[PDB]
Amino acid sequence: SLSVYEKVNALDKRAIEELFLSEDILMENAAMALERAVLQNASLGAKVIILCGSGDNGGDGYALARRLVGRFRVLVFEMKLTKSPMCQLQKERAKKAGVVIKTYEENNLECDVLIDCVIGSHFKGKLEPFLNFESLSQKARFKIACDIPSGIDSKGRVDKRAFKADLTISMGAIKSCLLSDRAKDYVGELKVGHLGVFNPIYEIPTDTFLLEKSDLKLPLRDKKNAHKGDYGHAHVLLGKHSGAGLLSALSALSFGSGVVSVQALECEITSNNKPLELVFCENFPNLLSAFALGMGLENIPKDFNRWLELAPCVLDAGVFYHKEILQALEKEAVLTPHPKEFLSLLNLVGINISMLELLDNKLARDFSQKYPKVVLLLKGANTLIAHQGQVFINILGSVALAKAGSGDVLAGLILSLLSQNYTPLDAAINASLAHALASLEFKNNYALTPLDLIEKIKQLE
Numbered sequence: 001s002l003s004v005y006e007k008v009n010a011l012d013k014r015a016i017e018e019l020f021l022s023e024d025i026l027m028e029n030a031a032m033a034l035e036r037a038v039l040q041n042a043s044l045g046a047k048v049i050i051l052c053g054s055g056d057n058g059g060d061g062y063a064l065a066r067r068l069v070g071r072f073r074v075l076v077f078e079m080k081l082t083k084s085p086m087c088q089l090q091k092e093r094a095k096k097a098g099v100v101i102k103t104y105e106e107n108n109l110e111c112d113v114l115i116d117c118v119i120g121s122h123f124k125g126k127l128e129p130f131l132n133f134e135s136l137s138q139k140a141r142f143k144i145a146c147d148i149p150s151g152i153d154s155k156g157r158v159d160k161r162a163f164k165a166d167l168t169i170s171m172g173a174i175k176s177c178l179l180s181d182r183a184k185d186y187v188g189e190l191k192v193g194h195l196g197v198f199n200p201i202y203e204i205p206t207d208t209f210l211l212e213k214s215d216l217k218l219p220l221r222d223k224k225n226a227h228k229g230d231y232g233h234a235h236v237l238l239g240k241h242s243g244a245g246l247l248s249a250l251s252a253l254s255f256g257s258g259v260v261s262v263q264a265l266e267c268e269i270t271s272n273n274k275p276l277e278l279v280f281c282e283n284f285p286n287l288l289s290a291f292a293l294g295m296g297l298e299n300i301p302k303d304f305n306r307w308l309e310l311a312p313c314v315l316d317a318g319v320f321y322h323k324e325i326l327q328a329l330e331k332e333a334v335l336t337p338h339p340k341e342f343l344s345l346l347n348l349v350g351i352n353i354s355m356l357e358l359l360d361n362k363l364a365r366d367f368s369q370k371y372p373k374v375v376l377l378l379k380g381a382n383t384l385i386a387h388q389g390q391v392f393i394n395i396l397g398s399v400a401l402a403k404a405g406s407g408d409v410l411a412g413l414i415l416s417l418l419s420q421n422y423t424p425l426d427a428a429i430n431a432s433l434a435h436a437l438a439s440l441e442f443k444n445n446y447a448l449t450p451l452d453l454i455e456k457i458k459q460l461e
Contacts, residue, residue, distance in 0.1 A: 001215050002192065003199075004208035004393065006154055006176045006363075007121065011204060015172075019197060023086055026195050027056070030171050031063035033193025034146060037169055038068065038113055041142045046112030047073045051104075051136065053118035053150070054080035055087055060146050060171075061117030062090035066097040075111075076101040079118050079131070106130055114140035116163040118150040121175060126159060127151045133163040147171045147193075148178060149186045155359060156180025169193040172202055174210050176362065179393050181381035190395075207365070207389045213396070216433040218460060219256040219420050231258030232289035232419030235281070235311075236412075239318060241296025242267040244408040247450045248295055249278050251412025254454050255434070257419045261285065266298055286310060290418035294319040294336070295408045308333075312424060314414045317407065320344045334375040334414050334428050336407070342378055365391050375424040377414075379407070383432050387425040397436035398445055405450035410435045413457070434460055 005011065015021045038048060050065050052058035058080070065076045078101055082088040094101060114137050119127075133150065137143050143165045151162025156177045166188040170178060172195050178187050190210075195202060221231070234257040238245040245262065246269070253260040261279040264270060271280050284291075284307055291307060293300075294316030305327050307313070312332040319325045320341035326348055337345055339355065346353060346367065364378050368386035376386040383394040413435050417427035438456040442448050 001212060001392070002174050002210040003203045003206050004174045004176055004179065004210050005206055006208075008172050008175065011172055011202060014204065015195065015197075015202060019201065021196055026172075027059055027063050027086060027090070029196045030060045030146075030193060031067050033169050033171065034060060034064040034115065034144070035067050037144050037167060037191070037193075038064075038072070038115075041144075041167070042072070042113045044071050045073070047075070047110070048113050048115065049109060049111040049140065050074065050076045050115045051079050051118050052076055052082075052087075052091075052101075053120075054083040055120060055122065056084050057117050057120030057146055057150075058082065059084060059087040059090045061115065062087065062094040062099075062101075064115065064117070064146075065099045065101070066090070066094045069098050074099060077104040078102070079104055104130075108139075109136055110139035111141070113142040113144060115144045115146060116150050116165060117146040118163070120147050121154065121177075123148075123151060123153050123159075125153075127161050132161045134161060137164070142166055143188070144169065145187065148175060149183075152177050152180075152183055152186065156183055156361070157359060158182050158186055162186050164188075167191060171195065173199065176208060179210060179362075179382055179395055181358070181361065184381050184395070208362075208391045209393065211392055211394050211396070211429065211433060213433070213437060215429065216437065217426070217430050218434060219417060219422075219430075221256070228258040231256055232416075232421060233258060233285070233287070234260045234415050234419035235285060235288045235291040236260065236262045236415070237291065237293045237297070237301070238262055238264045238267045238269055239295060239297030240266040242269050244296030244317075244405070245292070246275070246278075247405050247408040247454075248292055248412035248415065250275060250451075251409040251454055251457070252292075252416040252419065253277055254458050255413050255416035257289075257416045265301055284310070288419075289421065290314070290415055292316065292411050292415040295411055300324040304328075312418045314411055314418060314427075316411045317341060323348055328374075329371045330373055332373060332424055334377060334418070334424050336377050336379070336411055336414070338379045338407075362386075362391055362393070365389065375428045377428045377432065383436075385425070385428045385432060387428075392429055394432045394436060396433065396440070398439040398442070398448075400439050400442050400445035400448040401436070403448050403450070406439075406448065406453065409450055409453050409457070
């Protein structure tokens with residue numbers, strides 16, 4: 001788990017006021033982080049192009065140029081004249097350090113690695129026409145962005161001609177903006193570049209976290225005096241589109257639930273077909289560990305509210321389009337809404353927004369602070385998991401997950417963990433991670449199917 005910040009202004013400030021670091025040391029370190037990235041993706045001799053803006057971001061670029069002299073063929077393009085003092089100092093240092101700096105003009109940008117150091121975390125509104133990075137980087141093998149790709153604002157919105165990097169070196173710590181769904185296609189790999197001190201020292205409290213593969217806690221059994229009952233009883237409600245619910249049940253069984261039963265609501269499934277491994281019920285069991293509802297569902301069942309007193313649950317897809325999904329907001333529930341499904345949710349609650357919630361997708365956080373007893377898993381290119389004040393973002397999933405059914409397996413996973421007694425938040429976090437990490441196990445990102453995805457889960461490494 002990595003700490004996430006909307007702005008690191010306070011942290012830089014504190015690095016100087018509390019940690020006694022100087023701006024020179026912060027920048028020199030930033031330059032080292034960049035150097036490490038070049039050495040890791042380019043051989044000793046390659047051509048490296050560095051585009052420098054007018055502020056501290058460009059400063060990083062001139063500092064870097066300086067550090068590469070002698071081990072690489074460096075060309076620095078001064079995209080904007082220097083303004084910031086640190087930037088002017090670093091430019092002078094570069095010239096004196098034998099760096100080739102040329103002033104650019106629209107009228108051979110070919111290189112082994114191009115580095116974007118034009119604009120940092122203070123990008124405002126619009127990128128000028130001569131800043132067409134798409135063009136600037138057409139002849140670049142590897143593209144690296146310094147801190148944040150030029151053209152991305154603090155809210156996660158991306159300028160049309162923003163920079164597209166294979167690797168982004170977030171300085172000091174990760175910014176929220178690098179995790180926006182729309183920004184996925186521009187940031188490439190995210191790596192934190194250290195500023196002179198161990199990161200926990202540089203970091204300060206926050207309520208936003210970027211999950212890592214290491215945060216994953218598979219439901220591996222570790223006691224041996226365990227009995228089937230110790231692993232919970234999961235109950236899945238089959239809607240009109242029985243496949244969904246069913247896929248979910250098979251997922252819950254595959255993920256560790258002691259027993260998994262189903263129940264036909266708006267569908268013709270009985271002891272009829274139904275997989276040999278699933279247990280069928282004619283009615284809701286008074287003794288369960290958790291239940292799932294929403295997948296392939298057309299209408300909330302009568303006895304809903306009864307069930308909300310019987311055990312924890314994961315509410316999915318279809319419930320978000322029904323007033324009754326309101327009685328669940330004060331219960332132990334994991335909500336698994338899509339943007340639309342969520343648009344509908346904020347509304348039954350007195351909140352009408354358009355897909356302008358995409359521009360504020362995460363700060364979700366408010367929704368959770370409003371309903372502290374619930375867990376919100378907002379789906380998207382990047383998944384947002386919100387509980388009370390905290391937000392945990394998952395950016396590991398593969399686009400391979402578009403497929404319908406992909407979501408029913410996720411519900412089964414969260415359901416399984418709830419039946420195995422994980423806390424609602426922990427069940428959403430780990431299910432989201434198992435799911436996704438498992439999506440990476442497909443040769444072709446177009447051949448992902450529900451059943452194949454479950455097998456991958458059965459053997460997640």
